[PDB]
Structures are given as C-alpha cells and as structure tokens.
Design a protein around this nucleic acid. Sequence first.
DNA 1: GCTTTAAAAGGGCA
DNA 2: TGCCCTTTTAAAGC
Length: 182
Amino acid sequence: HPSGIVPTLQNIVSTVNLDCKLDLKAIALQARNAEYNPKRFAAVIMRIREPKTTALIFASGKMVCTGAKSEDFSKMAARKYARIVQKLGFPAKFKDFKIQNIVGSCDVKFPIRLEGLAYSHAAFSSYEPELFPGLIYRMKVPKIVLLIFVSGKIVITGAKMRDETYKAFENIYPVLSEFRKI
DNA sequence: GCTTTAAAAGGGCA
DNA sequence: TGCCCTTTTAAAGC
C-alpha cells in the first residue's frame, strides 16, 4: 500500500457445495431464520446475526453466502449455515468453498475531476453523470471495476482475492492524483 | 428509495 | 440461448 491507504472490505460473496440434495419446503418450515417463495426465487433465504450475513440455499445443495466483511467471516458464516442445515437432518458437507466476489471502498480525501479522468482513459471509463454520479472504471489488470466519485471516495469490486482489490487501488491512485480537482 | 458495479446460485420463459 | 429471477455492499445524486 504505497499510497498509505488500505481499502476497507465491505461485502464478500462466497459459495460452497453442501454436496447433498435439499428439501427446501422442509427447511423453510423447520428453520426460524428462513423465507422461501419458489414463485419468486429458487432459494431458501436465511440470515444469521454473527457474522451478519444472508445465505441463498438451493435444492441442489449449492449455497451462496453474502454480506460478510472478510473472507474468514464469509467462511465462518457459511459453515454456520451448513450446521443449521445438518441439524435439520441433511447430510451436509462443506465442499469447494470459494470466494466469488470481494467489494471494498476507500477515501483518497481529495476531489476528482471525473470528466477529465474519463477523457484521458476513454478505453476503460464510462461516465454518464445523469444515469449515475460515479465514473465506471473497468481495469484490465487486475480485472477489477472501480466506481470513482467526485468526493474522492472509491468503490472497488470484482475481486476474488483481496490483493486484487489493493492492487487495483494502488494502480488507480496516481491517476486519481493526476486528476485532483483544484 | 432509486440509479450503477461485481459475483454466485436456480427456475422460468421467449 | 440469454438472461432475469434474488441477495449483499459501498458510493453521490436524484
């Protein structure tokens, strides 16, 4: 972090394979923290308080865990959901846990000339303020999307490893500085 | 409460 | 096919 700023992780999306068929209607009735409407979505939605997360549990045994603040917390929450399911009578395992997306944010503490930035990086930028206030920066190396705001606040998403989040930010920092709004 | 970004999982449907 | 279905999260401006 040569910039001296470390992006704060805000959301983690992970998946794990409980590796066994699940009866969603049965889980929905037995569990307390569950909501299920197959007419609306194919998953049983369940939430736990710590780590604060929301899981999407499918009949196939696959599961998505969202909302955690770190990879470890995401794994811890997913394991907690796996236990809830096991305790409900299913032979759940914890197969192929994988971090699918990491979302982070930081503040460079200086305003940015978005249009000027967008113009000099047309091949990576999308800036249509009338639709969304942030400039969409699609970085190719690492393959990460940064939402750059006039305030100097930045959102960095698309990473499967936190080093990608940090690297994309370090890569953008000198560009942000070049376009500092005086 | 909406807009925008990323990602995963599945059923529905044109 | 292809893509929305839903869920999470930050941001600024409407």
